[PDB]
From Swiss-Prot, chain A:
One of its GO terms (molecular function) is magnesium ion binding. It is found in: Hydrogenosome. One of its GO terms (biological process) is succinyl-CoA metabolic process. Mg(2+) binds at residues 210, 228. The lineage of its organism: Eukaryota, Sar, Stramenopiles, Bigyra, Opalozoa. The gene is SCSb. Its EC number is 6.2.1.5. The chain holds residues 16 to 248 of 416 of the full protein. It comes from the Eukaryota. It catalyses: succinate + ATP + CoA = succinyl-CoA + ADP + phosphate. Its main location: other. This is Succinate--CoA ligase [ADP-forming] subunit beta. Its cofactor is Mg(2+). The keyword Chloroplast does not apply. Heterodimer of an alpha and a beta subunit. ATP binds at residues 50, 57-59, 118.
């Protein structure tokens, strides 16, 4: 059982992680109102509209009536309305849904940010090692099976002492192994600790962040941020 | 009678102007909630907390208990709480208030943005017709009053409103180039509709800014606003 992206992100934020949870909208008009209000705060910003569906391959999918993408860029609140109008109440077809598609009745409206780096990061129980593991790659936005098959050099698998860890030294090395320098190293450490707390304290079978991003803030600071999130339960 | 900065900006927005009206808060707790919610949209952003008081010289002013400034940068929602807590329910002393100061009962919280240019622009009604005054200089409203020669002044045919040629020339005279010229033209046309359709004696934008959006586009934006009736 998976929860939606915006709910996963809110849970991450609850445990001190940085995530772009945006605001959920149950109508196209509400989607526009969210965008309009955000222009009170960051005037002239752009928007991303993300269909909230329980299925994978959302961003790459296409709608039954022809629109391309479950994640779309919008320049104005009216463009946000137009996009949400083709998502809410309609069927999204992804690789994982097959031709049957999946109904969408809500979207997330987000501010558009400069994304500098995309990582993959997941926490799950590893059968072989008999403990939780952190799996991460510097090649976010890809099938994790493809990375292991075609690019095993950028994949990292970190065993975690179930409630005797993860240790700070493991997280610093992972962050540095992902190519992070400067303040982003500690930022990454802090965010991965929060993700583990979500995994542990919420009895999740998998916390998957694809992508875990390095983004720029509106005043150009570089920060770690969950840009998609999938949390699974039993 | 003047309306507050954030109300002035909301009125400008209603007529299609770009303005950082932020969100008003009447308690430090609400201020913090506003900030926390904004981190859902622009994670990691910084915040500006602006005392909403009907008095000038806020930025240089100081509060009784030591805090410097009516306009303050906050890095987190908790700094937003702390700053707002020193503003709301307290007295701000600026050169315009005198020692008697002015009570603050509200702040505006807005996202911190990179400001690339600050202009002064005002639309005023005195005994003749509307006039648009502006200068390319950045405490600039007193510079306007004691050095009026530093101002562009553009008379407006009340029957025909500002012409497009006047505003393009004004924007270019203020040093704007490229797409910012038309953006400025569009925003000043909105400020005129507020001035006209709301029977205002003054719409004062100090500063009218060039700011960067979160994805680094440059846009014209009202960063302060004072509207009189």
């Amino acid at each position: 059982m998976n929860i939606h992206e915006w709910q996963s992100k809110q849970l991450i934020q609850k445990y001190g992680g940085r995530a772009q949870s945006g605001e959920v909208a149950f109508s196209p008009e509400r989607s526009r109102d969210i965008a309009k209000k955000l222009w009170n705060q960051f005037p002239g910003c752009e928007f991303v509209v993300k269909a909230q569906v329980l299925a994978g391959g959302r961003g790459k999918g296409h709608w039954e009536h022809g629109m391309q993408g479950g994640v779309k860029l919008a320049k104005t609140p009216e463009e946000v309305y137009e996009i949400a109008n083709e998502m809410i109440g309609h069927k999204l077809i992804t690789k994982q849904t097959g031709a049957k598609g999946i109904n969408c009745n809500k979207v997330m409206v987000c501010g558009a940010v400069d994304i500098l780096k995309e990582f993959y990061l997941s926490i799950l129980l590893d059968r072989a090692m008999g403990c939780p593991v952190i799996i991460a790659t510097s090649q976010g936005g890809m099938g994790i099976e493809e990375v292991a098959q075609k690019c095993p050099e950028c994949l990292f698998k970190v065993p975690i002492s179930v409630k005797n860890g993860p240790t700070n030294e493991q997280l610093v090395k992972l962050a540095k192994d992902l190519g992070l320098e400067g303040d982003l190293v500690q930022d990454c450490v802090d965010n991965v600790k929060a993700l583990y707390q979500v995994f542990d304290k919420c009895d999740s079978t998998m916390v998957e962040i694809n992508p875990l991003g390095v983004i720029e803030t509106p005043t150009d600071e570089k920060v770690i941020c969950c840009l998609d999130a999938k949390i699974a339960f039993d």
